Short mmCIF file of C-alpha atoms and ligand atoms in Angstrom, two decimals:
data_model
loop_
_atom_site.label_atom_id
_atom_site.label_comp_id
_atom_site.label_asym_id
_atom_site.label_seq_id
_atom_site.Cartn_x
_atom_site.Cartn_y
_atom_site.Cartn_z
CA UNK A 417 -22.45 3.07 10.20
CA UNK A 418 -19.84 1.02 12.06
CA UNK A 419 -23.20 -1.14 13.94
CA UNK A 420 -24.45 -2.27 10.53
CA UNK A 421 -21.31 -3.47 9.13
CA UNK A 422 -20.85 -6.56 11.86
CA UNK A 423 -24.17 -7.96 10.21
CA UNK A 424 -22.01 -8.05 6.86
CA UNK A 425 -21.91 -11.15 5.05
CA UNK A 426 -19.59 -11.66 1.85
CA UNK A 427 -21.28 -12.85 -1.57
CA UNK A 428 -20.40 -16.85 -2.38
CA UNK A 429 -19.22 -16.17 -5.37
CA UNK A 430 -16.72 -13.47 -4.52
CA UNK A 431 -15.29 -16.10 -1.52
CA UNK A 432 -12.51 -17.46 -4.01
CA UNK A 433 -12.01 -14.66 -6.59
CA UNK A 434 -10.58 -12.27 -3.73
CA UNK A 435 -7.87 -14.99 -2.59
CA UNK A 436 -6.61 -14.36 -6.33
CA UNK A 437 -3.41 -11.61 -6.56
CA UNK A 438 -5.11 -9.84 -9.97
CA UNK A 439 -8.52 -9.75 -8.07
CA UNK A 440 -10.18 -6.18 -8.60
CA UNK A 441 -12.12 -4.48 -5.80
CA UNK A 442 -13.38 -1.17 -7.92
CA UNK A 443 -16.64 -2.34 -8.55
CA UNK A 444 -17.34 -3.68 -5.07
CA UNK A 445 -17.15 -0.15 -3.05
CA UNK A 446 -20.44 -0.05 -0.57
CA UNK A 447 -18.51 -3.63 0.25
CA UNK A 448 -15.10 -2.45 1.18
CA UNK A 449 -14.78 -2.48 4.80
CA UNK A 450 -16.78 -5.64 4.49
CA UNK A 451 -14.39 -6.72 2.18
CA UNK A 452 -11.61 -6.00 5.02
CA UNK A 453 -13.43 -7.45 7.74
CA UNK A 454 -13.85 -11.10 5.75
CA UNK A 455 -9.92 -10.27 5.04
CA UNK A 456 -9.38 -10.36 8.59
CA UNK A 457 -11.21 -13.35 9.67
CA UNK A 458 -9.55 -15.69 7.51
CA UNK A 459 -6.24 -14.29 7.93
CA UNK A 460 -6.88 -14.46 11.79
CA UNK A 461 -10.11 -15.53 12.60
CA UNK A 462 -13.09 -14.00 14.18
CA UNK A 463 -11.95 -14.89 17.98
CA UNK A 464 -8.38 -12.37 16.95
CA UNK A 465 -9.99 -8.90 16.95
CA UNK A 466 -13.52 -7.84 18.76
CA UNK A 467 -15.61 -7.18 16.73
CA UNK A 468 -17.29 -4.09 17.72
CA UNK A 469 -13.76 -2.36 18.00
CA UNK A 470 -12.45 -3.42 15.24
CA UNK A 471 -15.77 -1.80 12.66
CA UNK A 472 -15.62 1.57 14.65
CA UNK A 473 -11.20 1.23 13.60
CA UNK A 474 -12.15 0.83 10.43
CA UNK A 475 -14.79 3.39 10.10
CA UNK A 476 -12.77 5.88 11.79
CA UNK A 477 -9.83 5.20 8.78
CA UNK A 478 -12.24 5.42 6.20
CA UNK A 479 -12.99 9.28 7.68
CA UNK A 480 -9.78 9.94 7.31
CA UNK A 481 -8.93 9.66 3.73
CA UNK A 482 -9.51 12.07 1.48
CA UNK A 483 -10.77 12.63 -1.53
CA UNK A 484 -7.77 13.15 -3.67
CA UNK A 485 -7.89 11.29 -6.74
CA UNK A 486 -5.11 8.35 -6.08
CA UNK A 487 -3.92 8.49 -2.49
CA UNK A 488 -7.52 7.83 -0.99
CA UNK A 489 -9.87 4.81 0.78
CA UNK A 490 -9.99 2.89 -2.69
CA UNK A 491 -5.96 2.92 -2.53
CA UNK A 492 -6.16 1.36 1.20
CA UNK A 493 -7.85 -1.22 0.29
CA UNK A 494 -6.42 -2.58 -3.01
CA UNK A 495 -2.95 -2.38 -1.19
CA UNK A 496 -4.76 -4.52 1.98
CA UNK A 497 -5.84 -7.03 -0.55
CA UNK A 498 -2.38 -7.36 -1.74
CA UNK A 499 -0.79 -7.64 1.51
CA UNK A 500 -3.52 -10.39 2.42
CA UNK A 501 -3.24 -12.29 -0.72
CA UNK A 502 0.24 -12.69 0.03
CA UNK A 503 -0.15 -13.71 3.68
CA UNK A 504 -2.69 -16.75 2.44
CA UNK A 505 0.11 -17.73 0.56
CA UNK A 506 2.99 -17.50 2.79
CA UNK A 507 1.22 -19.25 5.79
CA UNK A 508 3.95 -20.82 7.47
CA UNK A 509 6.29 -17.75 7.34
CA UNK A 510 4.92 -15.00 10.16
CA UNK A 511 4.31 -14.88 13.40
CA UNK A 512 0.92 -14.44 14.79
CA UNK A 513 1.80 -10.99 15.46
CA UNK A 514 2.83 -10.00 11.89
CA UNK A 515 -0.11 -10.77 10.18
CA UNK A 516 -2.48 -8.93 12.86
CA UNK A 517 -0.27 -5.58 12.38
CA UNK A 518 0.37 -5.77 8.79
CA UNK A 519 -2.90 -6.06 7.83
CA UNK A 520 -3.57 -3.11 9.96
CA UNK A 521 -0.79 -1.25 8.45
CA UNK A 522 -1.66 -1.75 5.01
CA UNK A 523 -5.27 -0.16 6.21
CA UNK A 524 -2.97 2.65 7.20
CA UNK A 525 -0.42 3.64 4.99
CA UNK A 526 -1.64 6.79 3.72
CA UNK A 527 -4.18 7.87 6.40
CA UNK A 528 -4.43 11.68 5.64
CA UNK A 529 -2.38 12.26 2.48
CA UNK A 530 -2.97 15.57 1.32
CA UNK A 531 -1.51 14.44 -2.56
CA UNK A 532 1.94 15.93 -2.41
CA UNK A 533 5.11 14.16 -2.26
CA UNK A 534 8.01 14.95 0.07
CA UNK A 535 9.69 17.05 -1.86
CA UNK A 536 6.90 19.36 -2.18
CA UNK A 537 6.64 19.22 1.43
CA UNK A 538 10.32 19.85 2.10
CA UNK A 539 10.48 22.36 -0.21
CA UNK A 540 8.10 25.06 0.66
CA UNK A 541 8.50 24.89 3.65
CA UNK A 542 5.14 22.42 5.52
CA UNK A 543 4.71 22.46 9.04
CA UNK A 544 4.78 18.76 8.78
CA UNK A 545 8.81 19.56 6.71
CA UNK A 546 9.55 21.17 10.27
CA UNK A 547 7.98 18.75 12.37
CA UNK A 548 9.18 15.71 10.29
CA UNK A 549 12.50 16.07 8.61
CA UNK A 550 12.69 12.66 6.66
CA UNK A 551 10.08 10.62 5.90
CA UNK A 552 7.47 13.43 5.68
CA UNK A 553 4.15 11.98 5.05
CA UNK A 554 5.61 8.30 6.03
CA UNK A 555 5.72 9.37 9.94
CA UNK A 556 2.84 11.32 9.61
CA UNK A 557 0.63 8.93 8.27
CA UNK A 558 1.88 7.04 11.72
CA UNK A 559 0.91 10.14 14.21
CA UNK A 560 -2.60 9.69 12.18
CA UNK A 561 -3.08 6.07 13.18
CA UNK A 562 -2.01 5.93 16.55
CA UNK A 563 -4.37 8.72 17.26
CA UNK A 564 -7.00 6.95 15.48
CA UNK A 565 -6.25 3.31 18.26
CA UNK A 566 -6.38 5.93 20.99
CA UNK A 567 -10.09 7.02 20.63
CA UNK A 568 -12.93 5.83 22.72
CA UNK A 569 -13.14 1.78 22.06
CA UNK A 570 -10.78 2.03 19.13
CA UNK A 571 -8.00 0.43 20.51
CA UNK A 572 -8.37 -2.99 18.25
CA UNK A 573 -5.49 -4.47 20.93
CA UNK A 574 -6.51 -4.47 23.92
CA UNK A 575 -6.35 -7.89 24.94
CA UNK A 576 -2.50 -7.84 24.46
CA UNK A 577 0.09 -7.39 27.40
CA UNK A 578 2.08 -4.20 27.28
CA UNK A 579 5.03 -6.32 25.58
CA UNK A 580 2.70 -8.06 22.32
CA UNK A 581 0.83 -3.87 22.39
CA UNK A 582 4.60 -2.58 21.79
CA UNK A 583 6.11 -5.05 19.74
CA UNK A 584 3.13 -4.97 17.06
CA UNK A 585 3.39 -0.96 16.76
CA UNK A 586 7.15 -1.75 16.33
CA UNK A 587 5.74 -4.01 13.25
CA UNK A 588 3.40 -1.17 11.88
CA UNK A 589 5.81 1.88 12.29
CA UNK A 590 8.57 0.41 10.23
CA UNK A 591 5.71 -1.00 8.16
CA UNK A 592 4.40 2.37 6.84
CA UNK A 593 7.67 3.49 7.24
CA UNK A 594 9.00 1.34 4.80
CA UNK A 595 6.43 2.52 2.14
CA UNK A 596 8.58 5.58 1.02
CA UNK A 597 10.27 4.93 -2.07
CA UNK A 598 13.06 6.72 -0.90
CA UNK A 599 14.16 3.74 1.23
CA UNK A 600 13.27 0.78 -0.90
CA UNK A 601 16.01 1.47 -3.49
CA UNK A 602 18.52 0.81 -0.33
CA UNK A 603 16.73 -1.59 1.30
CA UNK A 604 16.38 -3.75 -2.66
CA UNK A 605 19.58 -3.79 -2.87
CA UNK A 606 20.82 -4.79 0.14
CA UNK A 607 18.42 -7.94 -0.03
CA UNK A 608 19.65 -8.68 -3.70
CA UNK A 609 23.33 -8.48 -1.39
CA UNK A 610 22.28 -11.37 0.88
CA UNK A 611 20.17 -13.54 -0.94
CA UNK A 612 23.45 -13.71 -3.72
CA UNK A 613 25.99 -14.19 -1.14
CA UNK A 614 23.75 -16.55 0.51
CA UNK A 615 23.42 -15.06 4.19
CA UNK A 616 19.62 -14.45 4.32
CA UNK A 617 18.01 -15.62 7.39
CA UNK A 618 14.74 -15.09 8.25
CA UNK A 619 15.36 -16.05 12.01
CA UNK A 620 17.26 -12.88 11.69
CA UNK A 621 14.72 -9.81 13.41
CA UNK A 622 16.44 -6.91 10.98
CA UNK A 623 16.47 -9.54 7.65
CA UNK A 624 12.43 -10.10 8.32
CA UNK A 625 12.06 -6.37 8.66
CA UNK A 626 14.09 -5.50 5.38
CA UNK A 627 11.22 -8.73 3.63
CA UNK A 628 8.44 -6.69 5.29
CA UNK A 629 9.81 -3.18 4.34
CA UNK A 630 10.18 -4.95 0.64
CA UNK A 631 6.33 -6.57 0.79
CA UNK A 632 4.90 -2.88 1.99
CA UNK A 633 6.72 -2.01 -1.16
CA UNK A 634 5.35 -4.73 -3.33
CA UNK A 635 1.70 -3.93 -2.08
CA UNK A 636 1.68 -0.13 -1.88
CA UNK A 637 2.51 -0.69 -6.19
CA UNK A 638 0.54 -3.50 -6.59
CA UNK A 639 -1.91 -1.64 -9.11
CA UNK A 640 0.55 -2.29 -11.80
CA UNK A 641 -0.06 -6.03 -11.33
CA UNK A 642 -3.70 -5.88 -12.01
CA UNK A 643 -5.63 -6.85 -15.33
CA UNK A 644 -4.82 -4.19 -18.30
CA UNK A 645 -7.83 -2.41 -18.07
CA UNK A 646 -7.74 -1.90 -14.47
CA UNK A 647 -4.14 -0.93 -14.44
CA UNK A 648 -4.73 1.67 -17.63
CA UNK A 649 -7.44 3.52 -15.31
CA UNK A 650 -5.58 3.09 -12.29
CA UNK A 651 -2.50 5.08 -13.91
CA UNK A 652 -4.72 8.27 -14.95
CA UNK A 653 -5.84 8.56 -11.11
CA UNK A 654 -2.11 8.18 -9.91
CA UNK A 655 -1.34 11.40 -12.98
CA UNK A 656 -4.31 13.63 -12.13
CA UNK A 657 -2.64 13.48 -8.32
CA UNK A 658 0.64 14.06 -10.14
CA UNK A 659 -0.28 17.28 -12.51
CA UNK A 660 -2.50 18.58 -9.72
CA UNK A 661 1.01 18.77 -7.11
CA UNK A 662 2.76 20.17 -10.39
CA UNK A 663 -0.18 22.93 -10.86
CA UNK A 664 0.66 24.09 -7.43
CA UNK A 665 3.93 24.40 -8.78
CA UNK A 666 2.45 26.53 -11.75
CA UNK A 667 0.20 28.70 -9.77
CA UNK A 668 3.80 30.27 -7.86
CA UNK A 669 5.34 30.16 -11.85
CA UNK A 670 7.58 27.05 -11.77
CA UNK A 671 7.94 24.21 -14.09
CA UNK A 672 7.48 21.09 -11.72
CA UNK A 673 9.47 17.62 -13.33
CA UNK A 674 8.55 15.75 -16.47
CA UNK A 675 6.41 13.63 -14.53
CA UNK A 676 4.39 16.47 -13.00
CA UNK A 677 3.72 18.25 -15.87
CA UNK A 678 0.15 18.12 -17.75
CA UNK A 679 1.58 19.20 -20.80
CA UNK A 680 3.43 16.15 -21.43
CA UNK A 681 0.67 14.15 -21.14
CA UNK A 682 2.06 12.63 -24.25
CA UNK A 683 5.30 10.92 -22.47
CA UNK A 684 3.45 9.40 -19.71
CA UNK A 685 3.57 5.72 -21.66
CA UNK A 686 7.20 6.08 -21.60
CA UNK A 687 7.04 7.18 -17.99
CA UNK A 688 5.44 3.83 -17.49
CA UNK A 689 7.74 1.81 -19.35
CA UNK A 690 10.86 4.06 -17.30
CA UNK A 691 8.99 3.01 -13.86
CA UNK A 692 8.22 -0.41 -14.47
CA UNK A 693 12.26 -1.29 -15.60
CA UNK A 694 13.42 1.02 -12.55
CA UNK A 695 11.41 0.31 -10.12
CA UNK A 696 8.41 -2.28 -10.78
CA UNK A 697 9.97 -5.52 -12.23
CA UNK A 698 13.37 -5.31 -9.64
CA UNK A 699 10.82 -5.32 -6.82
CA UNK A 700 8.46 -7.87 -7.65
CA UNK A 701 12.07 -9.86 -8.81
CA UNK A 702 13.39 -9.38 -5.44
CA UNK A 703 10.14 -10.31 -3.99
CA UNK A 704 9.91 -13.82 -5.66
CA UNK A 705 13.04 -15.06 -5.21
CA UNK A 706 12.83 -14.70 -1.53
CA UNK A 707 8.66 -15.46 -1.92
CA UNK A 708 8.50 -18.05 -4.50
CA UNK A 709 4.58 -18.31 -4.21
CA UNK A 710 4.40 -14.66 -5.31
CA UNK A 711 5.33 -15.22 -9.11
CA UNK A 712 1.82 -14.18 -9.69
CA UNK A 713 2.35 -10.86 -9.23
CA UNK A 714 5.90 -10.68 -11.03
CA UNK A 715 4.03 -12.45 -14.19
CA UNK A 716 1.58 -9.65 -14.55
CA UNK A 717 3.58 -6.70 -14.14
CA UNK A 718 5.63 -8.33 -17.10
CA UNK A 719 2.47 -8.09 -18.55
CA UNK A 720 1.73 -4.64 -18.47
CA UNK A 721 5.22 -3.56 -19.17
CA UNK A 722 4.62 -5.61 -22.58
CA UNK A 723 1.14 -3.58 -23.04
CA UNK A 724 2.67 -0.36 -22.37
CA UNK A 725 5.27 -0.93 -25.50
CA UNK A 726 2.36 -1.43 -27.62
CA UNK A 727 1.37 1.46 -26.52
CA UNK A 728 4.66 3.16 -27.45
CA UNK A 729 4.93 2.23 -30.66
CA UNK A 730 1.27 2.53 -31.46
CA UNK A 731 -1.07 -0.72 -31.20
C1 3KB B 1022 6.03 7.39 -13.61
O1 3KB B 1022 4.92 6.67 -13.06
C2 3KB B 1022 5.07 6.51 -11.69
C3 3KB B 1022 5.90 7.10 -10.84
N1 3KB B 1022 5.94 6.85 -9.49
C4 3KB B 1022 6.83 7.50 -8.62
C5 3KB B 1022 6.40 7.94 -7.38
C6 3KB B 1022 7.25 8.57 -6.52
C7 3KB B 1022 8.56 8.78 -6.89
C8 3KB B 1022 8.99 8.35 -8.12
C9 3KB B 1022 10.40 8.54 -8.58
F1 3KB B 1022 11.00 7.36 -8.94
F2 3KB B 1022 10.43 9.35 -9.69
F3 3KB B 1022 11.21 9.13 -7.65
C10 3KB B 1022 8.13 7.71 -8.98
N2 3KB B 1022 5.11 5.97 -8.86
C11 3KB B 1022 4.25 5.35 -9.60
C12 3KB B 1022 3.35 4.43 -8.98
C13 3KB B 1022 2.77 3.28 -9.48
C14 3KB B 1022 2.00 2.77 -8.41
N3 3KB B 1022 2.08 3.53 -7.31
N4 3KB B 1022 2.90 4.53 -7.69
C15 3KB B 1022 3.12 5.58 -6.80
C16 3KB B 1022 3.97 5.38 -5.74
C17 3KB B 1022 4.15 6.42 -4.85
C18 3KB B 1022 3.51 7.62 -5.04
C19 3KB B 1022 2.67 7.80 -6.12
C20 3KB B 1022 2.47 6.77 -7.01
C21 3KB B 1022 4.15 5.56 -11.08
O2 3KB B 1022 3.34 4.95 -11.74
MG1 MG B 1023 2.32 6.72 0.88
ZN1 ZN B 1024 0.36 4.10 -0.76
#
């Protein structure tokens, strides 16, 4: 598998659609980790990563999603695209080291996700609750990749000294870290804090890691910035995952959260609506006023949000 996919060539007429943020990659699937490798080469270029490494890394990653219905290799991807569509349009702003890791990161972010949150996991008591107290999945998804580097001519950086090698796994801990939503709502609003006041500095190591934890963010949702129909499908995969933690739930005799529930299949519009004000539109806010070439994505999750109150009150 991983010899055939160095021979991979991307279609011409798919060379400027993917630079776009609302580009869609569900119909392009035998393409994917093609589709990652071209993602690489532009971002980098072909002399950054070997080659051969770097298709049995991906290979190896694509093993190790599974197939639950949201949190799976489609996922990956889509949030890699987002994270590289940004980079193409923030050039000037990271280091060389940045946009090798969070690229890789992205790849990442879920490796392994079984389809239950943290709470679930801290709850009934997971081996993973005991091993990993906070940030459940978030560290685990970490053990999964590092593991994955340290196979047989997986390591994608090994042409780096033992300083760059530490430095980027520095970049993709906090990285993946940063993609549990328990930490953006602190790390939001202290940005909103310093951008106000006026005290942001990107020169700053801990002010770029807060913007990185806050683009992880902004990618890991990004599937509420897509076209309507895309992000109307992309929602019932992200609720099947949800009801099928909350039948777990049901199996023992409890009634899991609103959210969790398939018999209020009926409020999940106004779920949407809830998410997008809470959560959604304050990220992608943040996001622009500290990225101002990423209005793209802040225009269509406005979008949606309008689509979903048609929706609501029936159109
Ligand atoms: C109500 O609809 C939704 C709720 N959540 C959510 C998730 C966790 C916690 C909470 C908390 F805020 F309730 F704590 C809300 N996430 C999404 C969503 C949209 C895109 N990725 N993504 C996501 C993000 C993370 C996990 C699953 C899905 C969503 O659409
Ligand atoms: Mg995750
Ligand atoms: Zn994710």
């Amino acid at each position: 598998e991983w010899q055939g996919l160095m021979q991979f060539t991307l279609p011409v007429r798919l060379c400027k659609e993917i630079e776009l943020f609302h580009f869609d990659i569900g119909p392009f699937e035998n393409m994917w980790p093609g589709i990652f490798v071209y993602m690489v080469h532009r971002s980098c270029g072909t002399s950054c990563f070997e080659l051969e490494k770097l298709c049995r890394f991906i290979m190896s990653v694509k093993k190790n999603y599974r197939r639950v219905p949201y949190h799976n290799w489609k996922h990956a991807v889509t949030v890699a695209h987002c994270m590289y569509a940004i980079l193409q349009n923030n050039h000037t702003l990271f280091t060389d080291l940045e946009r090798k890791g969070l690229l890789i990161a992205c790849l990442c972010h879920d490796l392994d996700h079984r389809g239950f949150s943290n709470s679930y996991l801290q709850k009934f008591d997971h081996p993973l609750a005991a091993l990993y107290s906070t940030s459940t999945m978030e560290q685990h998804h970490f053990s999964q990749t590092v593991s994955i580097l340290q196979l047989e001519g997986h390591n994608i950086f090994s042409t780096l000294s033992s300083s760059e090698y530490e430095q980027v796994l520095e970049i993709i801990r906090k990285a993946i870290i940063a993609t549990d939503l328990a930490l953006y709502f602190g790390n939001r609003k202290q940005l909103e804090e310093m951008y106000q006041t006026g005290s942001l500095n990107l020169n700053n190591q801990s002010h770029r890691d807060r913007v990185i934890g806050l683009m992880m963010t902004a990618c890991d949702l990004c599937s509420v910035t897509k076209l309507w129909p895309v992000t109307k499908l992309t929602a019932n995969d992200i609720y099947a995952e949800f009801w099928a933690e909350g039948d777990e739930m049901k199996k023992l005799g409890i009634q899991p959260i609103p959210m969790m529930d398939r018999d209020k299949k009926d409020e999940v519009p106004q779920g949407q609506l809830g998410f997008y004000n809470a959560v959604a539109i304050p990220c992608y806010t943040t996001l622009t006023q500290i990225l101002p070439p990423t209005e793209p994505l802040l225009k269509a999750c406005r979008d949606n949000l309008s689509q979903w109150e048609k929706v609501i009150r029936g159109e």
